[PDB]
């Protein structure tokens, strides 16, 4: 019984409440089907000062469906909790020492308190160093959520390049994105702004930009074009860099990866994924 782990992440990982009783929220899709709903535990308070609780949350979504119809055509169980300390994986030095070991949802899978990844979760050399990813089951890219009425050119955009505290940028801390930035020595004004900027989770920043607190929110494409789209106070603007994809992590030479990349391809091939498009990325105009 595999131990999947995850991360809120909309529109591929919606996290909320049971119920009083147990249960999660009875919901329907736009096509008017059910919306499939897992127990996933986890985290419930985030919010800095107040204790936190590991409880019983209903998870759904792209990446919920996607592990769906995993378990089915593969013929595994599973039980699914979010990730403990909220975190995507980087690579950092642990207790001050010149130990390095991931955080995040790769640290967990390292660890055996994962044994698979399913989440928005980008493909990349340095990861796979350590683990195995799928072939990717999303394509997609860098762009830059902001406020409506801005636009960025994109990297040599000067409010990026020349930086001040009147246009404030940021991204997620632990996610490959904080990673890049802090690697790329191109890239040094940038990512000495952003690391005095940078939020815990992509809800919070995407919040941010909303209240006007941050200009700026650097971030994946799939994650930020549906936020956009369903707020119309948001938008996109920029294509940051190279195209990249979102994989299914397992640990290296695990028995599971042929599987798995074979039952996202015939996901490609099929119209599985587009279907899965149709119901959780592009399906209504803005509402939020
Ligand atoms: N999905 C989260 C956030 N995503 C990431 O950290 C990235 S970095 C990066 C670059 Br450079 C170029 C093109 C891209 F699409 C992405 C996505 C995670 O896995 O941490």
Same mark, same amino acid.
Request: hydrophobic letters at 35%.
């Given at each position: 019984?595999?131990?999947?782990?995850?991360?809120?992440?909309?529109?591929?990982?919606?996290?909320?409440?049971?119920?009083?009783?147990?249960?999660?929220?009875?919901?329907?899709?736009?096509?008017?089907?059910?919306?499939?709903?897992?127990?996933?535990?986890?985290?419930?308070?985030?919010?800095?000062?107040?204790?936190?609780?590991?409880?019983?949350?209903?998870?759904?979504?792209?990446?919920?469906?996607?592990?769906?119809?995993?378990?089915? /055509? $593969?013929?595994?169980?599973? #039980?699914? =909790?979010?990730?403990?300390?909220?975190?995507?994986?980087? &690579?950092?030095?642990?207790? +001050?020492?010149?130990?390095?070991?991931?955080?995040?949802?790769?640290?967990?899978?390292?660890?055996?308190?994962?044994?698979?990844?399913?989440?928005?979760?980008?493909?990349?050399?340095?990861?796979?160093?350590?683990?195995?990813?799928?072939?990717?089951?999303?394509?997609?890219?860098?762009?830059?959520?902001?406020?409506?009425?801005?636009?960025?050119?994109?990297?040599?955009?000067?409010?990026?390049?020349?930086?001040?505290?009147?246009?404030?940028?940021?991204?997620?801390?632990?996610?490959?994105?904080?990673?890049?930035?802090?690697?790329?020595?191109?890239?040094? /004004? $940038?990512?000495?702004?952003? #690391?005095? =900027?940078?939020?815990?989770?992509?809800?919070?920043?995407? &919040?941010?930009?909303?209240? +006007?607190?941050?200009?700026?929110?650097?971030?994946?494409?799939?994650?930020?074009?549906?936020?956009?789209?369903?707020?119309?106070?948001?938008?996109?603007?920029?294509?940051?860099?190279?195209?990249?994809?979102?994989?299914?992590?397992?640990?290296?030479?695990?028995?599971?990866?042929?599987?798995?990349?074979?039952?996202?391809?015939?996901?490609?091939?099929?119209?599985?994924?587009?279907?899965?498009?149709?119901?959780?990325?592009?399906?209504?105009?803005?509402?939020?």
């Amino acid at each position: 019984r595999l131990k999947i782990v995850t991360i809120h992440q909309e529109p591929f990982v919606y996290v909320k409440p049971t119920l009083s009783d147990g249960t999660c929220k009875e919901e329907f899709t736009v096509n008017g089907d059910p919306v499939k709903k897992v127990i996933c535990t986890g985290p419930n308070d985030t919010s800095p000062g107040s204790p936190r609780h590991t409880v019983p949350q209903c998870c759904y979504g792209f990446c919920i469906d996607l592990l769906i119809k995993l378990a089915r /055509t $593969m013929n595994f169980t599973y #039980e699914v =909790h979010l990730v403990a300390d909220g975190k995507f994986g980087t &690579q950092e030095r642990v207790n +001050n020492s010149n130990k390095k070991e991931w955080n995040g949802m790769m640290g967990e899978l390292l660890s055996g308190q994962a044994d698979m990844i399913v989440a928005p979760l980008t493909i990349n050399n340095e990861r796979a160093q350590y683990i195995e990813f799928s072939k990717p089951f999303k394509y997609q890219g860098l762009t830059i959520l902001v406020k409506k009425g801005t636009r960025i050119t994109g990297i040599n955009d000067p409010r990026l390049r020349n930086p001040s505290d009147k246009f404030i940028y940021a991204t997620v801390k632990q996610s490959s994105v904080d990673i890049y930035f802090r690697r790329q020595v191109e890239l040094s /004004t $940038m990512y000495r702004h952003m #690391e005095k =900027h940078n939020y815990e989770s992509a809800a919070e920043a995407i &919040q941010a930009v909303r209240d +006007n607190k941050l200009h700026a929110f650097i971030w994946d494409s799939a994650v930020l074009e549906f936020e956009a789209s369903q707020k119309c106070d948001l938008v996109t603007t920029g294509e940051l860099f190279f195209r990249s994809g979102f994989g299914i992590g397992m640990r290296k030479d695990s028995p599971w990866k042929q599987n798995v990349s074979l039952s996202i391809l015939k996901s490609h091939e099929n119209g599985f994924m587009e279907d899965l498009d149709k119901t959780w990325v592009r399906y209504q105009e803005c509402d939020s």
